[PDB]
Design a protein around this ligand. Structure first.
Ligand SMILES: CCCCCCCC/C=C\CCCCCCCC(=O)O[C@H](COC(=O)CCCCCCC/C=C/CCCCCCCC)COP(=O)(O)OCCN
Ligand code: SF4
Ligand code: SF4
Ligand code: SF4
Ligand code: SF4
Ligand code: FES
Ligand SMILES: [Mg+2]
Ligand SMILES: [Zn+2]
Lengths: 96, 48, 112, 230, 125, 97, 115, 208, 371, 176
């Protein structure tokens, strides 16, 4: 989800872009600006919400000991979905 | 590969002459090896 | 007689019993001038008297080495000379006297 | 005068009548472990982390609520008190979530530090932990409810100091939860202090979230100027 | 064997500190306050000496935090207030001393929670 | 080593040793660069019961040093720091080089 | 009371004669030091620098501090006469690369927050 | 004490205690205190005036004879009236033992050089003078040994800044290496790691 | 390394020798006061950068003694095995550099091939060729890979021939003997007084070895001999170092045959960090991992002096703890300091070219001298 | 037990003296050293043909740093700052804030390659394995500035080396 600054630079995932009057852009002349093309927020937004018939679900990120610490997520609030604090995955009870 | 050579000389790479944008007939370097072949070539694994 | 004691700079001392006896006698003579109640005087007199008794009660040199628990009689002689020098210097020092002064209220308090 | 003599680890101390075991230990220089006791709040006795052994007594007493008696010899570093501390810490950590890296109270956690100094170094809990849903009490206090240890410091502060009876416990036993039972914002001029008194990351600062770790911060003592209280 | 000279100690000429880092700095001698995020009191036992905060600016490259004073991270620990004052005086630094804050004793009573007629009685526990 | 027989004999004679037994260049004998997964045994402290930490706390058994003759507060045989060190034995495997 | 152990001297007179003795040695050395290190400074301004360095410590009223400063000065003399120092070590006394720091209030107010 | 705990050795503790009492008896003029640690280490606290005698005794006495100086160093404690403490570590090969002798001093009081007793002490005292500013009387040649020529102050002292007061660079205008006040691009980050909730009850201090 | 040496010569003879040090003084001891114990561990790799794990072992022993804990037996066996490998590395360095300075220059390559193999062992066990930071104050960091002991055995059954080739080049050569014999003779009393240790003592006939008199890890369970010189010259010290290489091979064999099973760090999570799986599954393990990698462990107050028999001599640390997680004071005692201090007396009445031989036989590395 | 290295006494009979004189005059041990060198010439050298051949390495090897991400594509780093705290050289600088979706992510993650000691403490302190020290070592640079890494450079390194990094972690995670 890389956008383009009005002056012409690529906007990073953090959102920092040099302003039009900023002298510090002179460092990028005859060179390039290091920007990562994969935005983690969009990539985790593309993930489908898992459907589980449990009131509490456990997540460790996948891989066992190669993931994050195992945490438990509550799914009682039907308005929203349960989100993992580490991995960002989303879970939901089977409404209707 | 050639397992009859001693350890260190039993694996080698012949570099390409034209990588991304430059002529590499002479100007070869060790950074041209992709990560999987990097793992194989440095004997970090026995599996290509 | 054995040669090359093995310690560089330490020469073989032929007829070591006489040297040991002279050194112990001089040690006792220097010790005599120290006040009687001083702990150093009585401790060093006890040790020197024991060693002199063992050297006078044993003509052999290897058995004397095993009894004296220092080994290599040459370095026992060297230790006797060091003890004599210390006795003279420490008679000059007079450390049997009371502590000069106490340290600051919290000089040795650890932590902080 | 009216002072009575009590012994902490065999050392005599003279205390007022009604002085608790915890304060008697304080007067000699020891701090008893605690999670629910606060000087400015009313005594609760819920946590049981202050359990200490009184010599020649088979049962441990809650130091935060038990008034000291004359001639009592507290045994603060006794084997029984250490075992009680380890058991209580085990019970506290049995259902606690593995949230330390993402918790805003990493290096400022009383739970963490008291686990390091008074608990065990491992777990024997082979079951699954519980998870309760978070509550929303406004834009100032961020609530992550699973982390909460049911100390009830927030309820006592709200009822006694802030003068607001909005906070309470609902349910029973293991499933009992601290909150409001309705979508309602706990908003008062003293609302932020519940972040400080909460020993865990159940109540954190929302504007301060994720920004800094405590070991990095430089502390400058200064004076408020937002009013004339100073 | 003893001079028996009577004068305040002054070692400023021997420590090698530059002149403008002696007469210009202002040290603070204090007992650090307790972190209100925790209820432990082990960090409020000693006395601390620290210098005054100087300019901290942003590095033009990478935006790190640059400084220009050598004494920004210097903190000393002392057993008593008098020791810190003596150190500051013998090192030639002007100081501000703050008296130690002690939490006053409090009257705690569990039974007061369940009062018959007083306001203390708690609505819940 | 892919060495001819005559060169092997020449190097053996010039050195005076049989080189082929102890080549300095690694060959097939070395362990494979890919290995099976390990298991790694757990420590003594892992026990589920009768494992209270206060019974295995090494740091909490450290104590301040014992004070003898704080100056602020009989035959008497002489004593040494420790018993005299025994002389070494002369290496009845190859005493002289 | 306040009895203190001597280092070299008992009173300020012995300290002053040591300081004077040290000063003479430095004075003799400067012409030689200037020539040997191929310094672009003159002997006059070198000796003025010597005078300034000695006057920096002119407010000391303690024989122990005075003769310890004499010991340090003798250590420096040693490093210079034996050519253990280099041209840079000697020229560090003059600060020819540091910009002049103004002293008046207005200039300090303009440059930054430093008093 | 199951396997994770360091085993004790009471025989060495008793031997070191007895020897400390012995040394204390022989030299009451200087020895102020004797201690044995829980890991069997004997340290002897003496008066500054007794550096030359006590060391000499420990080197020359038939019973002790610590002929090797393992290390000589200084420790700075700013909160004490006598700022610096001098530590001597000695090894006895005859009895296979180690001893420690501690002394105190401040900025202006010199300590007698022990070069005569041990040849090894000459460099050690030079380093102590360089890093702590403790002057040693009668040293053969006392001067800086590790710091740069013309360096002002002593780095090992607690008050001295971690990065010092001056830094070096090369200047093309004067064509030489010059020194200017330190200006870090990124300031060293100070961490407050000490926690509340004391770790070791056995070392708790009286509340005064 | 880097050395400034000021000397006065009457004709050919060196009347006086003065070494000026501090060209590699980085202020390690002051920097240690701003780190935790785990953070301060990697400095000891840099102290004597020819013998890394020996410094690691000395620091770990000091911290363990202050902590009142002990490592598991397998960790101690691994420590002694890698300490002997480190001894082999250091002695190869010392002998080959001595010969290189004198002018042989061939065994330097001959034995740096083996040194490269031993860096391969270091890298396989820790991931770093020379500054592994493997030995931690609670044991070792990671367990050995499944195929490491076999390769160590294969290497160690061929090293004696390399030592034999080195001796063929050096021990009986008349030029080498004329360069080393009767050079830098030191008496036993002078060596003891000046503070010498290790070979510098054992070359003068002194029977002293810390792995024998005061064993520290498992050295009282292994059998080896202590080579002793007879003349106190460079030749005797060279022969002693060669024989120590052979004895190190012997100890390596014994360690290989007697490696026990079990864990590698002390089963006390308040000192040694737990495993990754436990950290990612257990609440207590996660809390202890967090606190050990942010604050570190607190060490009870006290001062210790721990010394080990390093390849260069007695390497020691005087460690002072005030009860926090950062060391209050850390003094490092290196044998090279005393050896270079005695270099002046060692080079009296000798030629100018003999100073090089004396410096070489003293085995001086300025990282540990300057600190 | 102890051994003597130089405690031999040469024989003084006529045959031994003649043997020593023959050694002195005909240079026998010099010829022995020459023969050792000559034999050592005729054996295969130990040189490898870099860069076409590479030295052996291990899955544990510590090289260039990289930031990894989950299979879904979101970065593993949660801004816990444990790597920054443990860093013995203070080479890591971290700044964080809540992301637009409320996630706990870094806004700044810089590592100074010229202050790094490549000890690996950061990767073992990491709870979620976000930061690893990968197998690359051939990243020499012509200017000091390009050795000052920011978050974008480290994320690019992770995306570049993820295959080998994951393979090495798979090979070695059972020892950690
Ligand atoms: C019946 C009628 C016969 C008449 C009598 C003739 C009999 C001859 C018997 C004696 C002949 C021998 C003379 C040869 C030269 C000897 C000189 C000598 O021995 O000097 C050595 C010195 O020799 C050397 O050290 C030279 C070594 C230099 C390095 C060179 C490496 C040697 C190998 C290279 C190959 C030589 C090739 C020779 C042939 C060349 C063809 C052109 C002594 O020195 P040190 O052992 O240190 O003792 C002195 C202290 N008292
Ligand atoms: S509240 Fe404390 S113990 Fe719980 S997750 Fe946060 S830091 Fe960890
Ligand atoms: S939110 Fe905090 S203060 Fe309130 S009950 Fe839970 S742990 Fe206690
Ligand atoms: S490898 Fe070590 S020095 Fe480098 S960033 Fe990680 S913790 Fe810091
Ligand atoms: S330890 Fe890992 S998760 Fe924590 S800040 Fe560092 S890279 Fe991110
Ligand atoms: S502090 Fe007493 S029960 Fe909680
Ligand atoms: Mg909180
Ligand atoms: Zn997840």
């Amino acid at each position: 989800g890389v956008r383009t600054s009005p002056t012409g630079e690529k906007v990073t995932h953090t959102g920092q872009a040099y302003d039009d009057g900023d002298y510090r852009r002179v460092r990028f002349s005859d060179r390039q600006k290091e920007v990562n093309e994969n935005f983690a927020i969009d990539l985790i937004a593309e993930q489908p919400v898992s459907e589980v018939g449990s009131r509490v679900i456990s997540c460790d990120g996948g891989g066992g000991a190669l993931g994050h610490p195992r945490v438990y997520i509550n799914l009682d609030k039907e308005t929203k979905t349960g989100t993992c604090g580490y991995c960002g995955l989303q879970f939901r009870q089977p409404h209707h | 590969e050639d397992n009859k050579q001693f350890f260190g000389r039993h694996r080698w790479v012949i570099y390409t002459t034209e990588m991304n944008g430059r002529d590499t007939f002479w100007d070869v370097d060790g950074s041209m090896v992709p990560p999987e072949w990097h793992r194989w070539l440095h004997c970090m694994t026995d599996d290509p | 007689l054995k040669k090359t004691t093995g310690l560089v700079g330490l020469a073989v001392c032929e007829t070591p019993h006489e040297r040991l006896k002279i050194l112990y006698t001089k040690i006792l003579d220097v010790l005599g001038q120290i006040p009687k109640n001083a702990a150093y005087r009585k401790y060093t007199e006890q040790i020197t008297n024991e060693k002199l008794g063992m050297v006078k009660a044993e003509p052999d040199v290897k058995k004397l080495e095993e009894q004296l628990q220092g080994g290599q009689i040459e370095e026992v002689i060297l230790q006797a000379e060091n003890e004599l020098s210390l006795a003279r210097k420490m008679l000059r020092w007079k450390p049997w006297e009371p502590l000069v002064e106490e340290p600051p209220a919290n000089q040795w308090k650890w932590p902080i | 005068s009216n002072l009575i003599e009590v012994f902490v680890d065999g050392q005599s101390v003279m205390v007022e009548p009604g002085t608790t075991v915890l304060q008697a230990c304080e007067k000699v220089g020891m701090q008893i472990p605690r999670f629910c006791y606060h000087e400015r709040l009313s005594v609760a006795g819920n946590c049981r982390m202050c359990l200490v052994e009184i010599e020649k007594a088979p049962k441990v007493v809650a130091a935060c609520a038990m008034p000291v008696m004359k001639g009592w010899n507290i045994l603060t570093n006794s084997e029984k008190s250490k075992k009680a501390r380890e058991g209580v810490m085990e019970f506290l950590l049995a259902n606690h979530p593995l949230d330390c890296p993402i918790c805003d109270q990493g290096g400022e956690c009383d739970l963490q530090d008291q686990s390091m100094m008074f608990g065990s170094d491992r777990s024997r809990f082979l079951e699954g932990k519980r998870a309760v849903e978070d509550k929303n009490i406004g834009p100032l206090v961020k609530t992550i409810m699973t982390r909460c240890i049911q100390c009830t410091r927030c309820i006592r502060f709200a009822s006694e100091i802030a003068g607001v009876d909005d906070l309470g416990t609902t349910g029973r036993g293991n499933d009992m939860q601290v909150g409001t039972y309705i979508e309602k914002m706990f908003m008062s001029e003293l609302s932020g202090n519940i972040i400080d008194i909460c020993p865990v990351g159940a109540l954190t600062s929302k504007p301060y979230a994720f920004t800094a770790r405590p070991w990095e911060t430089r502390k400058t003592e200064s004076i408020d100027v937002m009013d004339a209280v100073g | 064997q003893l001079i028996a000279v009577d004068e305040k100690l002054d070692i400023t000429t021997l420590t090698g500190v530059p002149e403008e880092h002696i007469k210009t700095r202002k040290v603070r001698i204090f007992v650090p306050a307790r972190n209100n995020m925790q209820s432990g009191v082990n960090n409020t036992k000693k006395w601390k000496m620290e210098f005054d905060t100087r300019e901290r600016w942003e590095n033009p490259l990478m935006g790190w935090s640059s400084t220009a004073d050598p004494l920004s991270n210097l903190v000393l620990t002392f057993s008593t207030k008098e020791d810190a004052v003596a150190f500051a005086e013998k090192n030639g630094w002007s100081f501000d001393v703050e008296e130690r804050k002690v939490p006053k004793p409090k009257s705690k009573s569990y039974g007061a929670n369940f009062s018959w007629n007083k306001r203390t009685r708690v609505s819940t526990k | 080593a892919s060495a001819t027989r005559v060169i092997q004999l020449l190097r053996n004679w010039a050195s005076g040793r049989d080189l082929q037994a102890k080549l300095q260049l690694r060959y097939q004998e070395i362990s494979k660069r890919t290995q099976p997964p390990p298991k790694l045994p757990v420590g003594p402290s892992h026990k589920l019961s009768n494992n209270y930490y206060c019974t295995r706390d090494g740091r909490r058994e450290a104590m301040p040093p014992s004070i003898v003759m704080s100056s602020q507060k009989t035959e008497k045989k002489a004593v040494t720091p420790a018993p005299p060190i025994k002389r070494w034995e002369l290496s009845k495997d190859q005493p002289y080089l | 009371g306040t009895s203190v152990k001597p280092i070299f001297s008992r009173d300020m007179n012995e300290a002053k004669r040591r300081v004077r003795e040290l000063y003479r040695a430095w004075y003799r050395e400067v012409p030689n030091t200037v020539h040997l290190f191929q310094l672009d400074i003159s002997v006059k301004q070198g000796r003025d620098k010597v005078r300034e360095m000695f006057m920096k410590n002119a407010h000391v009223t303690d024989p122990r501090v005075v003769d310890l400063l004499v010991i340090k000065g003798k250590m420096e003399l040693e490093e210079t006469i034996n050519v253990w120092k280099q041209r840079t070590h000697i020229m560090r006394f003059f600060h020819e690369t540091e910009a002049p720091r103004p002293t008046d209030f207005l200039s300090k107010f303009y440059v930054g927050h430093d008093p | 004490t199951r396997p994770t705990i360091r085993p004790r050795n009471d025989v060495v503790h008793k031997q070191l205690s007895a020897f400390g009492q012995y040394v204390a008896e022989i030299l009451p003029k200087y020895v102020q205190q004797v201690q044995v640690s829980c890991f069997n280490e004997l340290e002897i606290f003496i008066h500054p005036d007794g550096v030359i005698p006590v060391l000499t005794f420990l080197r020359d006495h038939t019973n002790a004879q610590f002929k090797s100086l393992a290390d000589l160093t200084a420790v700075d404690v700013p909160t004490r009236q006598n700022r610096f403490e001098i530590v001597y570590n000695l090894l006895s090969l005859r009895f296979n033992s180690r001893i420690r002798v501690k002394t105190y001093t401040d900025e202006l009081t010199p300590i007698e050089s022990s070069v005569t007793v041990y040849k090894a002490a000459n460099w050690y005292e030079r380093e102590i003078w360089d890093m702590f500013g403790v002057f040693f009387a009668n040293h053969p040649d006392l001067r800086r040994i590790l710091t740069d020529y013309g360096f002002e102050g002593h780095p090992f002292r607690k008050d001295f800044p971690l990065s010092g007061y001056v830094e070096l660079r090369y200047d093309d205008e004067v064509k030489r290496v010059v020194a200017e006040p330190v200006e870090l691009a990124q300031e060293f980050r100070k961490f407050d790691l000490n926690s509340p909730w004391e770790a070791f009850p056995a070392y708790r201090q009286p509340p005064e | 390394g880097v050395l400034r040496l000021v000397m006065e010569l009457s004709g050919e003879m060196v009347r006086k020798c003065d070494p000026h040090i501090g060209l590699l003084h980085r202020g390690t001891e002051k920097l240690i006061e701003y780190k935790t114990y785990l953070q301060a561990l990697p400095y000891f790799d840099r102290l004597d950068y020819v013998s890394m794990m020996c410094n690691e072992q000395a620091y770990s022993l000091a911290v363990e003694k202050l902590l009142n804990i002990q490592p598991p037996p397998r960790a101690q066996w691994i420590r002694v095995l890698f300490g002997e490998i480190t001894r082999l590395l250091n002695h190869i360095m010392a002998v080959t550099t001595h010969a290189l300075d004198i002018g042989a220059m061939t065994p330097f390559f001959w034995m740096f091939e083996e040194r490269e193999k031993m860096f391969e062992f270091y890298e396989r066990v820790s991931g770093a060729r020379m500054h592994a930071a493997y030995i931690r104050p609670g044991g070792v960091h990671q367990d050995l890979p499944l195929g490491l002991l076999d390769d160590i055995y294969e290497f160690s059954k061929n090293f004696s021939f390399r030592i034999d080739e080195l001796e063929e080049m050096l021990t009986n050569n008349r030029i080498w003997r004329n360069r080393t014999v009767d050079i830098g003779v030191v008496t036993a009393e002078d060596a003891l007084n000046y503070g010498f240790s290790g070979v510098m003592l054992r070359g003068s006939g002194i029977q002293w070895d810390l792995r024998k008199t005061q064993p520290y890890d498992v050295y009282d369970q292994v059998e080896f001999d202590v080579p002793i010189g007879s003349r106190g010259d460079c030749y005797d010290r060279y022969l002693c170092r060669v024989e120590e290489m052979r004895q190190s091979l012997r100890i390596i064999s014994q360690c290989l045959n007697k490696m026990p099973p079990g864990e590698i760090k002390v089963d006390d999570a308040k000192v040694s960090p737990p495993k990754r799986a436990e950290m990612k599954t257990s609440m207590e393990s996660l809390i202890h991992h967090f606190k050990l990698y942010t604050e570190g462990y607190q060490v009870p107050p006290g001062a210790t002096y721990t010394a080990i028999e390093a390849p260069k001599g007695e390497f020691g640390v005087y460690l002072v703890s005030d009860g926090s997680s950062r060391p209050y004071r850390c003094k490092i005692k290196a044998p090279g300091f005393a050896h270079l201090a005695g270099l002046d007396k060692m080079s009296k009445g000798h030629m100018l070219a003999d100073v090089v031989a004396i410096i070489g036989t003293q085995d001086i590395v300025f990282g540990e001298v300057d600190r | 037990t102890y051994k003597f290295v130089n405690m031999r006494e040469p024989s003084m009979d006529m045959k031994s003296v003649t043997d020593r004189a023959a050694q002195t005059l005909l240079w026998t041990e010099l010829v022995r050293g020459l023969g050792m060198t000559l034999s050592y010439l005729f054996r295969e050298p130990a040189t490898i043909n870099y860069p076409f051949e590479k030295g052996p390495l291990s899955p544990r090897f510590r090289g260039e740093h990289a930031l990894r991400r989950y299979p879904s594509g979101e970065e593993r780093c949660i801004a816990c700052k444990l790597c920054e705290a443990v860093c013995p050289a203070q080479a890591i600088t971290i700044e964080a804030e809540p992301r637009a979706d409320g996630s706990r992510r870094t806004t700044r993650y810089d590592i100074d390659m010229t202050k790094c000691i490549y000890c690996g403490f950061c990767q073992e302190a990491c709870p979620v394995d976000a930061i690893v020290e990968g197998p690359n070592f051939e990243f020499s640079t012509e200017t000091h500035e390009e050795l000052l890494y920011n978050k974008e450079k480290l994320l690019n390194n992770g995306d570049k080396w993820e295959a080998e990094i994951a393979a090495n972690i798979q090979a070695d995670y059972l020892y950690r």
